[PDB]
């Protein structure tokens, strides 16, 4: 019932969600209670193999991966989904015996919905984690901005900018490629503005600093000022980055 979270999942999961409704209308307006619902062992077993596979890979994933929230959260998907099949198999079985079986129809619904749900969660976790990596990056930058307040010479400036400039490009890459992913325009926007807003203080940050580094090395007057047009820049940059972080973490 909510919009699907990114367009990769949407593509995957909507086609199913839809059809599961189609079934539901069907059930509850008179008449799968007409015929036959033919021997369905085969379609199911189809379904079972696929899920068995899915688990295969989830389990593979769990046992690799550094992310311990991943480790915790993915297992139950496996059940939700594993259990779901149980309900499908039974429905099959029930139908093989009695085509007019009414609880089979409920079972079928509820299996599918189960599988949707499992798979949904399963995908939501891997993605939550996929977002968490990005975050780690941003935090990395955030920390470095911190370190601008000690760059005190030409040597260190160059050194400093040698790393900042690229760290930025990596974050930039992924925010952008991340924003194209989302299904909410306001969030897509928010991100991009907040990243463009940063793309562009980068050189301000530079010059801000250059100046501090110039005036410190000239032993003269309004260090005082550079010092603040500089720190502010880090305050905007930072403030914005936490905003990006914020947005990434939304429904």
């Amino acid at each position: 019932m909510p919009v699907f979270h990114t367009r990769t999942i949407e593509s995957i999961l909507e086609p199913v969600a839809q059809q599961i409704s189609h079934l539901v209308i069907m059930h509850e307006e008179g008449e799968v209670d007409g015929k036959a619902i033919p021997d369905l062992t085969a379609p199911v077993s189809a379904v079972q193999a696929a899920v068995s596979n899915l688990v295969r890979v989830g389990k593979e994933t769990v046992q690799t991966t550094e992310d311990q929230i991943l480790k915790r959260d993915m297992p139950p998907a496996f059940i939700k989904v594993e259990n779901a099949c149980t309900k499908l198999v039974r429905a099959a079985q029930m139908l093989q015996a009695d085509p007019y079986s009414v609880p089979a129809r409920d079972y079928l619904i509820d299996g599918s919905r189960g599988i949707l749900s499992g798979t949904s969660d399963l995908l939501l976790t891997f993605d939550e984690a996929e977002v968490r990596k990005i975050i780690r990056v941003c935090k990395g930058i955030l920390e470095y901005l911190t370190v601008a307040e000690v760059v005190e010479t030409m040597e260190d400036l160059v050194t400093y900018t040698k790393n900042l400039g690229p760290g930025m490009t990596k974050m930039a890459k992924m925010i952008d490629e991340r924003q194209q992913e989302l299904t909410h325009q306001e969030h897509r926007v928010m991100l991009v503005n907040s990243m463009n807003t940063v793309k562009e203080l980068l050189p301000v940050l530079i010059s801000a600093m250059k100046i501090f580094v110039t005036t410190k090395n000239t032993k003269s007057q309004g260090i005082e000022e550079a010092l603040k047009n500089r720190n502010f820049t880090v305050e905007k940059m930072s403030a914005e980055i936490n905003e990006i972080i914020r947005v990434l973490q939304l429904t």
């Binding site: 990769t8 999942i9 593509s11 995957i12 999961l13 086609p15 199913v16 059809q19 599961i20 189609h22 079934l23 069907m26 799968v32 619902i37 033919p38 369905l40 379609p43 199911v44 189809a46 379904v47 193999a49 696929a50 899920v51 596979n53 899915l54 295969r56 890979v57 989830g58 994933t61 989904v81 499908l88 079928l108 599918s112 599988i115 949707l116 798979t119 399963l122 995908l123 891997f126």
Partner: peptide, 23 residues
């Protein structure tokens, strides 16, 4: 990564093909 999604997309058709197949 996309392999995970790879399999989840299958399960979907598994299902759809199934819910199909009742009619």
């Amino acid at each position: 990564w996309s392999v995970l999604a790879g399999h989840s997309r299958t399960v979907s058709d598994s299902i759809k093909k199934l819910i199909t197949s009742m009619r």
